[PDB]
Each structure stands twice: as structure tokens, then as C-alpha cells.
């Protein structure tokens, strides 16, 4: 048993026709103090997976090292480490899910909520959630903490069920994610303007976008 | 308890009161609080009295063995480390609050050690219930590089401040002067309170108490 000290807020994500998008702001809060403004919370693993992490930042850094170490270990005695025997999103997730549930069961949890987003060998979209309790679930849209309450309602209007995924393009999906990030900045007291976004597509591969900002902000109704 | 120490020109002067208490009762009026660590290092002790006695004795014993193996006099830094590291390990539960003072090959050194394992290295220190009363005297009158008899007087004056103004402290004043050329263990240095004189004799005369039976055995 601990308590989280330096924390990260919402990680949001969705599926689209060819792949998945994931996003998270660059803030490390220290309670109400907006302490660290340059924290990356999307951590890529290979060229087919991005792990988005919210919650305790020291435990995030620990998980970051576990994944870095996992890549090293998979390369060992593996001539197909950059091909058929590369790490898959489903492998990376299952590992983390095992760790998270083991740690909760020893009463010493990793104080995080994690979304693993990626594309599999056969082109299938992978998107799954896991948290400090070992609870796992998948859905066309996934969001942690605050984003579950505000981002999901907006993102579900684009993809409400499984049959909407082939109808959704990467442009429509990216707009929705960036729109949701704006809404979270208006309304989450522990969020920031600056964020990172990652697209993992089955054709164009991993695109990682840094130093994005929330823009087109409506404040004019305040003056009245 | 009021314990204190100063660094003076030639070395170290340590000081202590002599009151041991249980509850609000005084168990011992002339109790020794300045402990031997090595021939060139002594330690004043405040806090839980047993913890104070056993902690100094264990580190004194281990330094004796250390000093026999190396063949040279021990240092204050090693006494400081051994006490520090032990008190830290026990997370405050060993309630020893020490003033450690001695004279090395590297010169005179004075430390204060806290129950949780923190140490401050300083030219003057005070500890125990009477540390504020004693520190007031040092803030008033201390200066660096004092002569011996001046430093003795300042420490004595600081312990006295504790004796009179703090109810936890009392009895006599013990000093320990440590320099390169000598060690002067002054017990007592001062007797600031005379023992109260009794005006009557309340002792009973023989055969006053009522006995049931008696037995005598020789040795």
C-alpha cells in the first residue's frame, strides 16, 4: 500500500478502419500543483504498439523500463526479432496485465491505468485497458480516469458499436480525438494544453506526433 | 536532561546534569550521563536512559575491537557513523539523543546525534528537555576559539540554565574536557544546590516495629 504522488491524467483512444489512435497530455501534477510540464505518457514499443499510461508517474517510469527491457529480452537468440517473432500488442498487454494483477494480489499495486493501442501481424486493431486492480476490458473507444466521463461520450458518437469501425476514416478519428482533448482541457482541473498523439495504422505504420496544442478555444461568452 | 558541548581552541568541553527521573519522581539525584566511548572520545546522553547507556557501550566495545586491530586511536567520525547507522536502522525506536565529542589525529570534533539517525556537526550543541535553556546561554555568550577556563564556564553556565529553568533537569554539573595533551573528567564540577537539611530526627527506636518470627543463617 502506497499513495500516488506525481500523477498523470486522462489517456484517450479509439479504433478506426485501418488502425488505432491514442493520445495523452504532457503534465505531471503534484496534487493541485501543475509541477512538470514536459512529461511524455505515450511510450512506443517497437513499430506496432503504443502504451498510454495514467496515474502515478514513478510507477509509469518503472513500467517504461519493464517494456524497454522486454524489447532487449525478445531480441535475445531471436533471428526474427524484427519480423515474424517481433513483439505484438497482445503480447505486451498480456505481460502488463499479468504484472498489474500480481502486484494488486501482493497488496502493493502499480498505481496506474494503462491503455495498450496497436496493430497485430494480421492487420487487426488492438485496443485494451488494464488498471491497478488487474481489471481488463476492450471497446471501440477507451479512456482512463477523467476521460471516461467526458471523452468517451464524444468518441462513441463516431464509433458507437463494432460495425462503425470500417466506416470511420483516420481523418474523422483524429479530429474526434483532438476535439475530445480540447473538451478535457476546458473541464479537467488537472490537465494541460500541450499533448502527444499517436496513430498506429496497418498501412502507414506508427506516426508519433509531439508538442500538439489545444486550439480554437471558445472563451468569448465570458465577458458577459 | 540538559547535555551540551562546545568546541574551544585546544579541544572539546562536554557538559551534563545529574537528574534521572521516572514519572515525575527523581530516582537518582547524582546520575552519571557522560559516557566513555574511547580514551579520546566521550558521549553525553539524553532520552530513554537504558537506550543511552547500551548504545554508547555497544559502540564503545566495537571501537575498542576496531582500535586493537588497526593499532591506532579511533576517530570521532567512526564513532559518529556507527551510532548514526544503528539509530537510523531502528527508525527512532532506540530513543538515544547524544552529544558526541572527541579529539582525533584530525583535531577536535563535536556532533549531536538524534534518535532517528540524523547528525549535525557543530561548534556548539545542546540536547534533552533542557536544550533550549542551555542553547539560550550559548547564543548569548559563545564565540569561536575560546580559552579552556572560559569554555568550561560557558558550558557550566549552560547546564545551570537547564538545571534551574527545566524541571526535567537538576542535581550537579558534570564536565569532560578533552584536548590533545589531556583528558579531564570532572565529576562533580559544581554543586549548585546544597542538600536540604532536616530539622527533626524521625528514625524509630529499637523494638518499635512489630515482628512475627525470625531466622538467622551464617555464610
Amino acid at each position: 500500500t502506497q499513495q500516488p504522488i506525481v500523477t498523470g491524467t486522462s489517456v484517450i483512444s479509439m479504433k478506426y478502419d485501418n488502425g488505432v489512435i491514442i493520445a495523452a497530455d504532457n503534465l505531471g501534477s503534484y496534487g493541485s500543483l501543475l509541477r512538470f510540464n514536459g512529461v511524455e505518457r505515450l511510450i512506443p514499443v517497437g513499430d506496432n504498439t503504443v502504451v498510454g499510461i495514467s496515474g502515478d508517474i514513478s510507477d509509469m517510469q518503472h513500467i517504461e523500463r519493464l517494456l524497454k527491457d522486454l524489447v532487449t529480452e525478445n531480441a535475445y537468440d531471436n533471428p526474427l526479432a524484427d519480423a515474424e517473432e517481433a513483439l505484438e500488442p497482445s503480447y505486451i498487454f498480456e505481460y502488463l496485465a499479468t504484472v498489474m494483477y500480481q502486484r494488486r494480489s501482493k497488496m502493493n499495486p502499480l498505481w496506474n491505468a494503462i491503455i495498450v493501442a496497436g496493430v497485430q501481424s494480421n492487420g487487426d486493431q488492438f485496443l485494451r485497458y488494464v488498471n491497478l486492480l488487474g481489471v481488463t476490458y476492450s471497446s471501440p473507444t477507451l479512456a482512463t480516469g477523467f476521460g471516461a466521463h467526458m471523452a468517451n461520450p464524444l468518441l462513441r458518437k463516431v464509433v458507437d458499436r463494432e460495425s462503425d469501425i470500417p466506416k470511420t476514416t483516420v481523418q474523422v478519428a483524429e479530429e474526434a480525438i483532438v476535439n475530445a482533448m480540447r473538451v478535457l482541457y476546458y473541464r479537467d482541473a488537472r490537465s494541460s494544453r500541450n499533448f502527444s498523439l499517436a496513430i498506429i495504422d496497418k498501412n502507414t505504420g506508427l506516426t508519433f506526433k509531439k508538442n500538439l496544442q489545444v486550439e480554437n478555444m471558445k472563451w468569448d461568452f465570458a465577458k458577459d | 536532561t540538559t547535555i551540551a558541548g562546545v568546541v574551544y581552541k585546544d579541544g572539546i568541553v562536554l557538559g551534563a546534569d545529574t537528574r534521572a527521573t521516572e514519572g515525575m519522581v527523581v530516582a537518582d539525584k547524582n546520575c552519571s550521563k557522560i559516557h566513555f566511548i574511547s580514551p579520546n572520545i566521550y558521549c553525553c546522553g539524553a532520552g530513554t536512559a537504558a537506550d543511552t547507556d547500551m548504545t554508547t557501550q555497544l559502540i564503545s566495545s566495537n571501537l575498542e575491537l576496531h582500535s586493537l586491530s588497526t593499532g591506532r586511536l579511533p576517530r570521532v567520525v567512526t564513532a559518529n557513523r556507527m551510532l548514526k547507522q544503528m539509530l537510523f536502522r531502528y527508525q527512532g525506536y532506540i530513543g538515544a539523543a547524544l552529544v558526541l565529542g572527541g579529539v582525533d589525529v584530525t583535531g577536535p570534533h563535536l556532533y549531536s546525534i538524534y534518535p532517528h539517525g540524523s547528525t549535525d556537526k557543530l561548534p556548539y550543541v545542546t540536547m534533552g528537555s533542557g536544550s533550549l535553556a542551555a542553547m539560550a546561554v550559548f547564543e548569548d555568550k559563545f564565540r569561536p576559539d575560546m580559552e579552556e577556563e572560559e569554555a568550561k564556564n560557558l558550558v557550566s553556565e549552560a547546564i545551570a540554565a537547564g538545571i534551574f529553568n527545566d524541571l526535567g533537569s537538576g542535581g550537579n554539573i558534570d564536565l569532560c574536557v578533552i584536548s590533545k595533551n589531556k583528558l579531564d573528567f570532572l565529576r562533580p564540577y559544581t554543586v549548585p544546590n546544597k542538600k536540604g537539611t532536616r530539622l527533626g530526627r524521625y528514625r524509630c527506636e529499637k523494638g518499635t516495629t512489630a515482628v512475627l518470627t525470625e531466622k538467622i543463617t551464617p555464610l
Binding site: - | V77, T78, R81
Partner: protein
């Protein structure tokens, strides 16, 4: 005759495995020498790089144990490195526990006590090395202390180790018989190194280039080894007088 295979007494009161570990000491065919100045302690050793494929910078039997302590080994490199790593660990632990830099003689005694254990316990073999420790101790001044596979140790005014140790020892013995002092009466370490090299040349009867020697120097608050070019400067000065 299993009293020759493990560390138990023979009928003569001898430990043959200890004696055979002493013979492993010379397997490298390298001679070392150590001397003391006023402010310094100097240790020199032969350097032999037989293979052209070897990186000569990595061929060394001198070790920086702590900042103040240096150690030269006579014996095979695996046992030398075993001893080096332990002495480094021991010197670090000492400073942490006791708050001052481990003295040279205290490390020597510690390594000697470990060596003794291998002579009494059967499952451990002795290391086939002689360890010469050097420093400028802050209490005892310039210091040389040596350890062997028996677990013996002693302080030295000067010393020598290797196949031709007796020749070097007598050369040094004769110099100190003249001067009637326990050290090299010299201000600079540069001249003490020059003395060390000069008296090894005389004793062994061989000339040296910059790549044939390996030098270590202890001063107050640091021990360091000389580079090839630092030795070359030393060899030039010897030749010029």
C-alpha cells in the same frame, strides 16, 4: 597422498597446496619492486606484451584499489583480478561503515586474513598471487605492505617480488646499508621513480624502453599510474646523467 591435494597437514607439518600456490606466483615471469620516498611511495613492475594482437593498454598488473591505495600483483591475472575486486569492495565498505579512508596496512591485514581462511578451509583453494599494497597513509606516512598465499603479511621499507626477487632485494639492501635510512631522501616523486627504475636496471642487468615498464605512484590523497609517455620522460632523465 591426498594431504598434497587439499589444505591439510602433511606428516612434516606442511601445507603443500599453499607451497604450490607460491610457485604459481612466478608463472607470469614478471618482477615488481616497491620503494618509499619522503612524501611518496613508488611501485614499478615489468610489462611484457608477447603477442602483437594484444591491446597493450589493457595488459596491466597494477590496480587502483581506492584513491589513496594502489596494489601490484605478482601472479596469474584471473587470481589477481579476484583479489583486486575484493580489495576494492572491502575499501568501499570500510569507508561507509567507519567514515574514513581504509588505511593501507588495515586492507593488507584484511586480505591476509581472507588468504588464511583458504589455508584452513578445504573447499576453497588459495589464490596463486602475492599482493603488494602501497599508499601515503595519513597517520603512518609512506607505506608498503605485502600479502601472500599463506596469509602472512608485513610492512616494508622497500620490497621486491618475482623470479629474480633475491637479486633486487640484495641490491636494495646494499643501498640502505650505505644511506642508513628507511627511505629514498628525495622531495619529488619523479626522482623516486627514477631511483626505482635505475636500481631495477642495475639488479636485473636489462635496459628498458617506455613499453617494458609499468609504474604506480602514491602521494598524499591520491594514487595514480604513469602513462607510456610519463615513463619515457623518466627514462630520458636517467640516461642524461
Amino acid at each position: 597422498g591426498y594431504d598434497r591435494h587439499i589444505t591439510i597437514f602433511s606428516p612434516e607439518g606442511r601445507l603443500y597446496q599453499v607451497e604450490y600456490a607460491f610457485k604459481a606466483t612466478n608463472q607470469t615471469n614478471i618482477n615488481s619492486l616497491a620503494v618509499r620516498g619522503k612524501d611518496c611511495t613508488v611501485v614499478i613492475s615489468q610489462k611484457k606484451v608477447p603477442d602483437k594482437l594484444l591491446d597493450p593498454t589493457t595488459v596491466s598488473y597494477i590496480f587502483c584499489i581506492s584513491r589513496t591505495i594502489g596494489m601490484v600483483v605478482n601472479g596469474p591475472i584471473p587470481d589477481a583480478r579476484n583479489a583486486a575486486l575484493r580489495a576494492k569492495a572491502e575499501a568501499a565498505e570500510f569507508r561507509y561503515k567507519y567514515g574514513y579512508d581504509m588505511p593501507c596496512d588495515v586492507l593488507a591485514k584484511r586480505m591476509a586474513n581472507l588468504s588464511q581462511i583458504y589455508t584452513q578451509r578445504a573447499y576453497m583453494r588459495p589464490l596463486g598471487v602475492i599482493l603488494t599494497f602501497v599508499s601515503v597513509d595519513e597517520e603512518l606516512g609512506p607505506s608498503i605492505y605485502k600479502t601472500d598465499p599463506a596469509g602472512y603479511y608485513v610492512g616494508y621499507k622497500a620490497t621486491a617480488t618475482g623470479p629474480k626477487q633475491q637479486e633486487i632485494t640484495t641490491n636494495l639492501e646494499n643501498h640502505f646499508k650505505k644511506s642508513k635510512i628507511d627511505h629514498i631522501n628525495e622531495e619529488s616523486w619523479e626522482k623516486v621513480v627514477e631511483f626505482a627504475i635505475t636500481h631495477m636496471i642495475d639488479a636485473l642487468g636489462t635496459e628498458f624502453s617506455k613499453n617494458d615498464l609499468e609504474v604506480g605512484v602514491a602521494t598524499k590523497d591520491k594514487f595514480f599510474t604513469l602513462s607510456a609517455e610519463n615513463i619515457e620522460e623518466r627514462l630520458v632523465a636517467i640516461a642524461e646523467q
